[PDB]
Ligand binder design. Sequence first.
Ligand SMILES: O=C1C[C@H]2CC[C@@H](C1)N2CCc1ccc(Cl)cc1
Lengths: 191, 193
Amino acid sequence: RSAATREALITGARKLWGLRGYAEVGTPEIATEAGVTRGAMYHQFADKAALFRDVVEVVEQDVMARMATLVAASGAATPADAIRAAVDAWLEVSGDPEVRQLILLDAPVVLGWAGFRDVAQRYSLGMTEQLITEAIRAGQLARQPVRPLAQVLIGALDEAAMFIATADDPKRARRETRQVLRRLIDGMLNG
Amino acid sequence: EERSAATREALITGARKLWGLRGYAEVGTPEIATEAGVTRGAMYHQFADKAALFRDVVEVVEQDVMARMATLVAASGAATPADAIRAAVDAWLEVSGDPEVRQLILLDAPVVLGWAGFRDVAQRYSLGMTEQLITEAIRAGQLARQPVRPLAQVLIGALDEAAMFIATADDPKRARRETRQVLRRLIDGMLNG
Ligand SMILES: O=C1C[C@H]2CC[C@@H](C1)N2CCc1ccc(Cl)cc1
C-alpha cells in the first residue's frame, strides 16, 4: 500500500523530471501521473527533494546494472579491456537523456556536492575497486592504493560526463573526452 | 566613503579569520561586525546578508590559493612543463590541506554557494592555470597533442575529488600520501618526461 504509493510516485517523477527536469515539474502533477492524492504523496514524502532522493537511488541502481550488463556484453578478455569497456559503458549510459537530466544536471543542484558524492560513491565504488583489484591481480596495473585510485577515477568520469552534458556541441565533446579518457586510462595501465 | 571601503576590507578579513577557525555555521554576522569594529548598519550597507559576505571571502581565499600554487611551482625549480605538472599536483595537495582552505572552500563553499555557484568560482580560478600547464607540455612534446579543455576538465574533476577525499578521511595523513602516489603514477604514465 505504502510501497505501491512510493513505487507509483517514483516511476511518475522519474518519467516527468526525466523529460522536463526537476525545476519544471511540481509534486501535484507527479501525484496525478502516479494516480495518487496529494495527501497519500505528502504521507510518503515530506517535500519535492525527498522524492527526488528516492528517484536518484532507483536511477543509479539501473545505471550500474546497465553498465555491468554492458561490460559483460563487451566480451573483454582482460581486466584492462574491462576497465576500457566500463569507461565506454559510462559514456554510452550518461548520454541517455533521462540519466543526463536527473543525474548530471538536477542531482548536483538538489543534493549538493556532498550528497551527490555520497550517492555516486555508494553506487560505483565497489564496482570500480573490484575492476582495479582484478587489473592488479592480472599484473596489468601496478600494486597501488585501491580506494584512492577508485575515488580519483570516479571524480574524473563523473566530471567527463558533466563536461559532455553541458557542452555547446555534445557530439564533439563526447568524441574528444573519449580520446582524453582513453589516454588517461592507457597512462594508468601496464603493457 | 573611504570609511565604507575600509569597512568592506575589515569585514572580509574578520569573516575570513573567524569562519576559517570555526565553520560558516558557527559564526553569526554580529560577532563578525564586532571583530571588524563596525556597526551592523555599516555591514548591512556593504553586504545584503551572510552568504553575500561569504562570497567575497571565497574570492579572496581562491586568489590566495592560486597565488600559493603558482609560488610553489616557481619555487620547485621545475625546468620542464612535465616537472611543473609534478610540482602543481603536489602544490594542490599541500594547499587544500591548509585547514582554512579545507573549511571555507571544500566544506562551506559548496553548501553556501550551491553547486552552480561553487563550480563557476572553482572553474574561474583553476581552468586557466590547468590549461596553460597542459598547453606547455604539448608544445614541449612532453604530452600527446589532444583536446586541451577536456583534459583540463577531467584533471580538475580528479584533483577536486582528491582534495575532498583527503578533507573527509578517517586518516587524512594517510589519504594524502596515498592519493599523492596514485596521481603521481597516473601523470608519470601520460608524461613523455
Ligand atoms: O549513477 C552513477 C553513474 C555516475 C554518476 C553517479 C555515479 C554512479 N557515477 C559513476 C560513474 C562511474 C564510476 C565508475 C566507472 Cl568504471 C564508470 C562510471
